[PDB]
Specification:
This protein is of the alpha+beta class. It contains twelve helices and nine strands. Bound molecules: calcium ion (CA) (2 copies). One calcium ion binds next to helix 1. The protein binds a DNA duplex through strand 1, strand 2, strand 3, strand 4 and strand 6. It comes from Gibberella zeae (strain ATCC MYA-4620 / CBS 123657 / FGSC 9075 / NRRL 31084 / PH-1) (Wheat head blight fungus).
DNA sequence: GGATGGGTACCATATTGGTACAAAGGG
DNA sequence: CCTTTGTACCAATATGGTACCCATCC
């Protein structure tokens, strides 16, 4: 069964803690939701997660994407137990803390709809304001004088367990095989990207794997990547590491194919014509080219 | 009446992930 | 000379997010 730190690592990568407000004829409803949305080829892994959470919530599917949503207050309590015991470490931790606060207010009040004059409602709107994309312009018109709450700082966070990294990479990792345009040479890369708001966390990856380096992703500097390329490191640190703490979902297959190329390179087979042919074949069917 | 659940449409960008080469750097 | 590595480039979409509407429950 799926390890709990894997579930957390995967949520730091792809999950969401949201509170939304809707008007319902002179009353506002507070709608909490926890959400994971993936491309449809990973429905299977969503099923394993939903399962981990006592089959709370529901999956929905639309030809290209699939979505796990947990929206009822009963169901949400068990989600919150998990993340209290196995804490997030990305900036997503802060949206989770704010989320948790609102949930507690709703439980204290035993209900989800409020008349504009409610004090609890204003406290909630104040907190909602510092979450995710903040207030809508519609709500902003109806509550002009609300001061957003303090967004908690998330600093100096350590990777709590290797299984977190397996979850996280199952979410944001990428395994590549580079061929030269001249078609002579082959190399590998393992990359993880993130928004610049988590540059600190990503720089500590160099320490975790004990190799690789850290770059900006584009001229904007609004995103950064962790990268390993050096083949000694890939073959001695990165691959053994993930043979033990296994990645999951379709990305597992890309990791298997990547591993296969890596063995051919170990044995020098990448400098043979057939070896290069086999590697090109493997490459043409991995990642976004996968059947 | 009113409240909640849940399916599904819709929005925006942080990833998703492909390419490329010059400068190491070895024997 | 020859092959690996660090770094760069960047288009677009798989993600992270939000809204609306109604059937059914109290
Ligand atoms: Ca993410
Ligand atoms: Ca992903």
């Amino acid at each position: 069964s799926i390890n709990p730190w894997f579930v957390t690592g995967f949520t730091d990568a792809e999950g969401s803690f949201m509170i939304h407000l809707e008007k319902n004829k002179d009353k506002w409803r507070v709608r909490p939701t926890f959400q994971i949305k993936l491309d449809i080829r990973d429905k299977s892994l969503l099923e394993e997660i939903k399962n981990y959470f006592n089959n709370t919530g529901s999956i929905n599917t639309s030809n290209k994407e699939c979505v796990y949503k947990v929206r009822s207050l009963k169901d949400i309590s068990i989600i919150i137990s998990h993340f209290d015991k196995y804490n997030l470490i990305t900036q997503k931790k802060a949206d989770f803390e704010l989320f948790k606060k609102i949930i507690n207010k709703l439980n204290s009040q035993e209900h989800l709809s409020y008349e504009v004059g409610a004090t609890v409602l204003q406290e909630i709107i104040s907190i909602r304001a510092s979450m995710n994309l903040g207030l809508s312009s519609s709500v902003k018109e109806d509550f002009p004088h609300i001061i957003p709450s303090n967004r908690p700082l998330i600093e100096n966070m350590n990777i709590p367990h290797p299984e977190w990294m397996a979850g996280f990479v199952s979410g944001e990792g990428s395994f590549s095989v580079y061929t030269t345009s001249d078609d002579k040479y082959v190399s590998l890369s393992f990359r993880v990207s993130q928004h610049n708001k988590d540059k600190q966390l990503l720089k500590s990856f160099v320490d975790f794997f004990g190799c690789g380096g850290f770059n900006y992703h584009n001229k904007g500097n609004k995103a950064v990547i962790f990268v390993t390329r050096k083949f000694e490191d890939i073959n001695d640190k990165i691959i053994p590491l993930f043979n033990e703490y296994k990645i999951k979902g379709v990305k597992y297959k890309d990791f298997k194919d990547w591993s296969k190329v890596a063995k051919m390179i170990e044995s020098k087979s990448h400098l043979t014509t057939n070896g290069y042919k086999e590697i090109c074949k493997i490459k043409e069917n991995m990642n976004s080219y996968r059947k």
